[PDB]
Design a protein around this ligand. Sequence first.
Ligand SMILES: *[C@@H]1O[C@H](CO)[C@@H](O[C@@H]2O[C@H](CO)[C@@H](O[C@@H]3O[C@H](CO[C@H]4O[C@H](CO)[C@@H](O)[C@H](O)[C@@H]4O)[C@@H](O)[C@H](O)[C@@H]3O)[C@H](O)[C@H]2NC(C)=O)[C@H](O)[C@H]1NC(C)=O
Ligand SMILES: *[C@@H]1O[C@H](CO)[C@@H](O[C@@H]2O[C@H](CO)[C@@H](O[C@@H]3O[C@H](CO[C@H]4O[C@H](CO)[C@@H](O)[C@H](O)[C@@H]4O)[C@@H](O)[C@H](O)[C@@H]3O)[C@H](O)[C@H]2NC(C)=O)[C@H](O)[C@H]1NC(C)=O
Ligand SMILES: *[C@@H]1O[C@H](CO)[C@@H](O[C@@H]2O[C@H](CO)[C@@H](O[C@@H]3O[C@H](CO[C@H]4O[C@H](CO)[C@@H](O)[C@H](O)[C@@H]4O)[C@@H](O)[C@H](O)[C@@H]3O)[C@H](O)[C@H]2NC(C)=O)[C@H](O)[C@H]1NC(C)=O
Ligand SMILES: *[C@@H]1O[C@H](CO)[C@@H](O[C@@H]2O[C@H](CO)[C@@H](O)[C@H](O)[C@H]2NC(C)=O)[C@H](O)[C@H]1NC(C)=O
Ligand SMILES: *[C@@H]1O[C@H](CO)[C@@H](O[C@@H]2O[C@H](CO)[C@@H](O)[C@H](O)[C@H]2NC(C)=O)[C@H](O)[C@H]1NC(C)=O
Lengths: 439, 439, 439, 49, 49, 49, 126, 126, 126
Amino acid sequence: WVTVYYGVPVWKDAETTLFCASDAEKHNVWATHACVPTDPNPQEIHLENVTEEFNMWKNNMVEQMHTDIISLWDQSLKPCVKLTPLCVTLQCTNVTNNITDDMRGELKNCSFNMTTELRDKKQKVYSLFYRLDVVQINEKEYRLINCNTSAITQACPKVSFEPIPIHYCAPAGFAILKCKDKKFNGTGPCPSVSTVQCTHGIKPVVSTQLLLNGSLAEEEVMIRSENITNNAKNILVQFNTPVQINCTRPNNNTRKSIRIGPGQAFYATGDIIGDIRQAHCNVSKATWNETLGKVVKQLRKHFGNNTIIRFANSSGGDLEVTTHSFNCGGEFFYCNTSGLFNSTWISNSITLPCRIKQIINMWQRIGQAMYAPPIQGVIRCVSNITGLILTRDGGSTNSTTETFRPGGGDMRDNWRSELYKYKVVKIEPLGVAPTRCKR
Amino acid sequence: WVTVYYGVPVWKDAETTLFCASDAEKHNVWATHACVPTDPNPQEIHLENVTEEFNMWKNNMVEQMHTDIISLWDQSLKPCVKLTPLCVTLQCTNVTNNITDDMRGELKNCSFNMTTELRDKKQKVYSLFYRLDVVQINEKEYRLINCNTSAITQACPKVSFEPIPIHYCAPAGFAILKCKDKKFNGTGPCPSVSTVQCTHGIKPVVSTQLLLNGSLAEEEVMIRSENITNNAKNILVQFNTPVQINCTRPNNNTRKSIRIGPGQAFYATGDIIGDIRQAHCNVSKATWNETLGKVVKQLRKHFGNNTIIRFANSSGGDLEVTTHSFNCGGEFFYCNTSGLFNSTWISNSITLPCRIKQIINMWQRIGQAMYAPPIQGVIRCVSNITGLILTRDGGSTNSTTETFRPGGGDMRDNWRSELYKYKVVKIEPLGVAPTRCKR
Amino acid sequence: WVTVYYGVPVWKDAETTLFCASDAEKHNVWATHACVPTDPNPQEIHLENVTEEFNMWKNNMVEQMHTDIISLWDQSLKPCVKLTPLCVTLQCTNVTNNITDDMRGELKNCSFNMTTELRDKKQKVYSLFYRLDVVQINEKEYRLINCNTSAITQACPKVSFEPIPIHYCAPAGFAILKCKDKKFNGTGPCPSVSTVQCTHGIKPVVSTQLLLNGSLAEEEVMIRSENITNNAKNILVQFNTPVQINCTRPNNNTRKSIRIGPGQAFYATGDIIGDIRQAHCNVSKATWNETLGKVVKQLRKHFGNNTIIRFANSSGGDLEVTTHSFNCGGEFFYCNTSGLFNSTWISNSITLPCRIKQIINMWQRIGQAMYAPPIQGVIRCVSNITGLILTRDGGSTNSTTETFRPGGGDMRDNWRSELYKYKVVKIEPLGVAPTRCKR
Amino acid sequence: TNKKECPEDYTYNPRCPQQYGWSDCDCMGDRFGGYCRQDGCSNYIHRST
Amino acid sequence: TNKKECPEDYTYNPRCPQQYGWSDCDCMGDRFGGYCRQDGCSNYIHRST
Amino acid sequence: TNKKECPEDYTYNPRCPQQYGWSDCDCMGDRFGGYCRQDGCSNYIHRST
Amino acid sequence: FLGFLGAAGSTMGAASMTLTVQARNLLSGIVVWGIKQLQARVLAVERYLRDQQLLGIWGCSGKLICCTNVPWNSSWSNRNLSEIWDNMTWLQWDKEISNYTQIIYGLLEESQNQQEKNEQDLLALD
Amino acid sequence: FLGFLGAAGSTMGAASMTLTVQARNLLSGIVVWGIKQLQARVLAVERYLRDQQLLGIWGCSGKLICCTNVPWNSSWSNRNLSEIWDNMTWLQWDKEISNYTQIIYGLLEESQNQQEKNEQDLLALD
Amino acid sequence: FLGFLGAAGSTMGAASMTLTVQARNLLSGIVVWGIKQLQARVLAVERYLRDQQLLGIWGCSGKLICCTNVPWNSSWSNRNLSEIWDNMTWLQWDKEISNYTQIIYGLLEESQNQQEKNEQDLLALD
Ligand SMILES: *[C@@H]1O[C@H](CO)[C@@H](O[C@@H]2O[C@H](CO)[C@@H](O[C@@H]3O[C@H](CO[C@H]4O[C@H](CO)[C@@H](O)[C@H](O)[C@@H]4O)[C@@H](O)[C@H](O)[C@@H]3O)[C@H](O)[C@H]2NC(C)=O)[C@H](O)[C@H]1NC(C)=O
Ligand SMILES: *[C@@H]1O[C@H](CO)[C@@H](O[C@@H]2O[C@H](CO)[C@@H](O[C@@H]3O[C@H](CO[C@H]4O[C@H](CO)[C@@H](O)[C@H](O)[C@@H]4O)[C@@H](O)[C@H](O)[C@@H]3O)[C@H](O)[C@H]2NC(C)=O)[C@H](O)[C@H]1NC(C)=O
Ligand SMILES: *[C@@H]1O[C@H](CO)[C@@H](O[C@@H]2O[C@H](CO)[C@@H](O[C@@H]3O[C@H](CO[C@H]4O[C@H](CO)[C@@H](O)[C@H](O)[C@@H]4O)[C@@H](O)[C@H](O)[C@@H]3O)[C@H](O)[C@H]2NC(C)=O)[C@H](O)[C@H]1NC(C)=O
Ligand SMILES: *[C@@H]1O[C@H](CO)[C@@H](O[C@@H]2O[C@H](CO)[C@@H](O)[C@H](O)[C@H]2NC(C)=O)[C@H](O)[C@H]1NC(C)=O
Ligand SMILES: *[C@@H]1O[C@H](CO)[C@@H](O[C@@H]2O[C@H](CO)[C@@H](O)[C@H](O)[C@H]2NC(C)=O)[C@H](O)[C@H]1NC(C)=O
């Protein structure tokens, strides 16, 4: 006989829209005024005698993460002042005198013919720029480098990009399953199932090459990829130990505002107090030494057990992916990581120089260049590397040596590196089973 | 005794909001990214032993159609570049040399003082225009003709206006009833009832005088009007046969872009390869001959069985309604249809010259002029006339002869010409009836 | 035994979002196109044998009122023309000849270099201004006074600010309770409970010092405050009688438009027909005399039964709060009320001169200055004072005499003066009680 | 008393007689969507005040 | 230790003493909605650090 | 017949060979997010038409 | 089989009494541009729920057909049961008895209220 | 008649037991600027449905008054039934027993679960 | 206690039959940037209501477990009741019988329709 049952703890794979939550103000671009409070208490339930199949490469949570971040980023500039009036010919020379050699040619001192709130007279102003945002017009005369591509908007100096963690939460009828497994590498079944209302919080840190401020593996370095033999895919390496980096922006800046119009002002670099120094990051050398060895052992286990592995720096190309990129204090840093990838592991302090830019085309879109206003004073940043984005050279069958390089570019992979622990399912509580009972 | 019943297949006339659907991209202005998929299969159910009353002149589906189209049209320009910087004095002369007489005076060759992304220097540029968009300033010196009325926006050359059909669908609790009748003329009962979840797709083709790319009558030409004796109402004539028209824009155009600003460029007509010819449409003559006769017979049946009917061309007035208007390839055409309405039917190839415009105030609104960018190459359009919009002259009691002219203006009537087949009803499933049963 | 009951008429204090409603067009900024119809009939139900506790100082209805008004105000300018092109140096002199002494120095006659729809030539125009909106630039040369703070937008001369009353309505599951009590003074229990679906309509009149166009107390003047001994709080005085004021703007104005751009025009004061007179308000003297005495008696009852009370005019400071402010006909008036607060009440016609401004920063926000276009002709306004906003001087322990001054500034208090009659509750229909019955 | 009202199915449109120089054209047929046409012209409803 | 905090029902508003030249007016009464008035003026809560 | 299609995991990006002067770089690895890199370069799928 | 309104022409005795009413007419009842889409979903939900609440208050939830103890008032319509059920349909029927809908709803509510009251008294005395 | 909260002052024995609870208190329960309007509709729907689901889990759907087999715990409130029902009202009542609401809900759920379980055993052995 | 899906590993005979199904699996079922938030609420409502309407049409509303008079078809799955209920769980079970879901739903609807029809005939002849 047929008996109908309701409330059955059964589910199917599903794709739905998740809620964002934080902190169980108008500050902070990453939805702090928009997301709801997190649940004040973890609701995690371990499920015994069950298994589940995960595939981090087919997940949709990452698409939402992507969508949400791009959207929030765009919203943050909507009410902000456009810098259209600023793209003018710059009369410009080099910053000099106080440059400690390393920065020679990096800073520009340019003059402008700017508008005033009265639409008639102009003001003669000048400000300082990084050379990376300035290009010569006639092969002196300079222009903002992104002027001839698309519109530039000044970020409102009310907010910053501090990566406050966001928890994702299921709507009623949905649940998020998590593995508590240690061997699971992103695909297939794991003998570990635990259900939660929400994920832990994930910090939306945007970077290339080195994954920063994330979670760590507990027992072993975990290396994950979609296809171990596909050199067109990246590799996610999750460290089981942190690697600390001490970064600095060693310039005591003074910022000034220039009134542009009726309620508009431009935030200009004024000058530098004291001398001028190159930005840099100090990586613990000993830690890197050991960390790399651990990574190599794990790479060898997947392939190359009897071969050797070399690391090399990045390929020529766009700065955004050829160097390490991060944001700190709201400032945009570009760092030369070649000092980290210059070795061969055959078994048997590091200072990285950096560059700074003020015009950022985050996410490569047209009409969305963002101008990062100066930050006064000196910036220090401390964080740990929790993992790597690696690529492997192809073009060779000589298995004796494999070559790896730091990668990054598609931000989806950084999010995947945290989201992989979770799967979204939909509950289907209504069903039947045979019995010996009849109405 | 009273017995309560639920799920009764009963309904009332109702007005609700319908869903749009298509194709069971970011291209196409008419909601292709916004509408939902259509149902993959027709759900039509014929209802036996029932009749229903329809009134196409009191329908609300048309208001939604109107609302949706205007809204979609406006949305399509929201992210597009404004042409404000372009309304400057034009230094302008005539295009000459290669004009094959017919086009003399139609094209202008004008020079401009335009901005550049650098807000200081200007560029000297020139481009070609149709005379209909250009007016003399001082009674040489010219201006964009719509400059002194309202803002002009350039359509983004990413999209076009291709009339991809849209199906309208009922929300749960609603249904759409359709007549399968052949004699029904828009009002009153029809002995034919069929219920659907959704309407067939309707192509949002916007035109005057001749109804294009629509459905055909199956047995007879159907002539419908709200009031057969009211000369202030239009007449919808639905052909039971197509009339093909071959239209062309016989000019091999070259388009060029002019950079205007930081992420903005104007699409200008560059020049014409080969000689310059007037745009035109070729109407099958024989078909028109027979088609008109059929229309007249049906008009005679409504009135004038013993009288004669003459056709005449349009009255003086606004181009938008005095000529035939259509869009094809994204281009805006104005055609002289007087060659189609120059006859008397007493019982007992046609070439239409055309004009082209680039500034279109679609729907007659202020601040919404749209600039249609040039299309390169040569355009051919093939379509059939499925019906007519006619008006009848008043001012006379001499029944001997009636006079008809092509009309059009209020777009609601074009939509009505397709929507008339359908009615929206709301289901009211709960009710009572007498029985011999008691709880 | 436990018995479960549903539909219990029980409730808790609650905060929810209320619906706005009016009139059981595109004109009128205060949501007339946005709010729903009011219920055509009062649904008030008196509840016998019940009491309820109210606290007008902890109410949330006022926050919604605040939020809604600010939002509607902002929405009204969204589609309107910006006046950015207008902030130019003004070449300016005094209006003279026809000034009847009182207005000397109040009106300015200024010349401008304005744009035209053709972006090349400029037009020489001039217009008249109130001095309060114009400031000298160089200590002749003048500027719009708010130019150097923030953007100014012209209100669209399609709408006005007429305070059409809005009713607030509960969502299902909510109800609004009202006191019909006469002694209740904003806090504590009242032995009067009546439940409604919606509140009566409240006119969103914005003013300082004198509360206009509101409801009246029925039996006594009611004086309400959050804390009777806190001199940092305001005092709301609700009259039981109206005091009529006849205000005028005694200048027969002519308005002219200046075309600014492609679909933009500025509405300028043209000139004054006849002579030039100062704006003013005529307050019934006898009524004020008696009204004040009633207010004083009630103040004495709260404190000062054996002391005397004096009234004094406002303190130095921002015009917006040092004078009486109101809008009428869409015009913005500033009136000198010192003639109303110049007396001591020891127990045992009035003409107020006024000023007019065209740039209003309503709600003190940046980038939201509104330009009030001129109104042609002569304006008369008639309304009654229904109450006062008073403050009491501190700094003294000499109880012999208390000093009061007119106040106003935070608009929340004006709304509170009407909203205080109501409380929002949520219904919780499900609960249990002991019985002698078992399933 | 009365007002210069247009007949049903016509509305008032001052643009047409001014733009075109058309006599006895105060009102324009609604059937043309706000556009001006000579055959869409009408004067006001013919009644005195 | 302490901070230059305003008393309840007053907030900090640097605009007022600067715009008007008012002594002992660091804080402004909340009762005036952010607008400046002499009788709305206050100094900070009187406590040492 | 055939088309100049990119191999899976690469897309077409004309910017890269033009911006950099890179030979045999018509397609760019998707793994780099649209950004240009020498090691992300590829030619088209090697088949004739 | 017959479709959502398929049974409409079969007169009441077959039009709904074949449980066509459940099979489709009821089953289908609840089956920034895109604002309209939420409005449609919400309104459909509200209508569904109003019907269920009415059945609930009348003691008719969980039923396609629900008999009560209220006598039919012939004053609203006087016809033989055989014509009412076999030759007339539901749409025609509503045209004849729509004006008495509110009267009957009030009667249904009061009857159910009294029926429950009586059961409550019986439990108290049990 | 009495209105939505009209019966509130009539003490429980008349305030709800006259089925005023159904007639209005329950009947009314479920009866880009305009975002608020959808939020209000949705929230009203959610509250209605939560009440119904609770009645459902307790085996009390389709009832205005639902007796269970759970004894009253006097430890939550010890009063005579005549005062409880005739002189005290529902608002006053909740003030006295609100703190035991969750205890009773848990008890109601378990009892219903056991009752259904017993019926399931009876069918199996039938 | 066990949590929302806590009973999933306990095989059907304990996984749902302990009324864990009600206590949490069912109880939790219905428990311009922020557009997503309304969409989520609405969709949750729709799913809840679809389940209830199905239980309604089958005559199983107000029940956690509902027996019908439809025989089990072994053609869909032939196993002993003791293994079905004691060693296999609900997820495993659905994997085996998912393909027959629609067949059974149709059968359930027809049976309920006939059962009600028979009751209607009995009242008419009473
Ligand atoms: C990885 O996690 C780390 C742990 O939190 C992150 O370190 C934190 O990084 C911030 C800088 O990005 C550090 O500095 C803070 O800066 C604010 C300054 O803003 C305020 O003051 C300025 C002054 O003009 C004003 O303009 C602003 O509007 C604000 O008002 C200080 O207020 C804080 O006290 C602090 O100095 C944190 O110190 C630092 N945390 C720790 C524990 O060191 C790290 O950045 C993360 N990694 C990445 C890449 O973000
Ligand atoms: C009535 O129905 C007819 C049947 O479909 C419609 O005919 C179709 O009309 C279109 C033109 O409007 C014809 O031409 C097509 O044009 C596109 C060109 O766009 C793409 O390429 C350009 C090149 O620069 C690029 O700029 C665009 O962004 C696009 O990438 C071609 O790709 C198509 O192959 C085709 O040529 C259709 O051929 C024509 N269909 C038929 C069957 O002839 C007719 O227009 C309808 N009536 C009306 C008034 O629209
Ligand atoms: C307190 O309640 C009083 C009672 O209603 C309010 O009095 C009303 O105030 C309005 C003015 O604000 C009076 O005048 C009306 O003005 C309109 C003019 O607008 C139309 O015409 C102009 C002409 O160019 C056009 O530009 C506009 O777009 C409109 O087309 C007239 O049409 C009305 O007939 C009337 O004259 C009312 O007369 C007056 N009511 C009474 C009964 O006197 C009072 O304002 C309220 N208090 C406050 C502070 O608002
Ligand atoms: C990444 O490695 C390559 C090779 O190790 C570096 O290539 C050098 O680029 C500079 C640029 O002017 C040349 O002068 C050198 O001759 C290049 N080296 C070789 C061997 O050709 C590249 O610069 C490295 N990138 C970083 C950030 O170190
Ligand atoms: C409010 O009252 C004060 C005092 O009664 C007025 O202060 C006067 O301000 C004018 C401004 O130039 C001075 O010339 C007078 O000497 C001031 N009076 C005193 C006594 O100092 C103030 O103007 C009043 N405000 C209004 C609107 O009347």
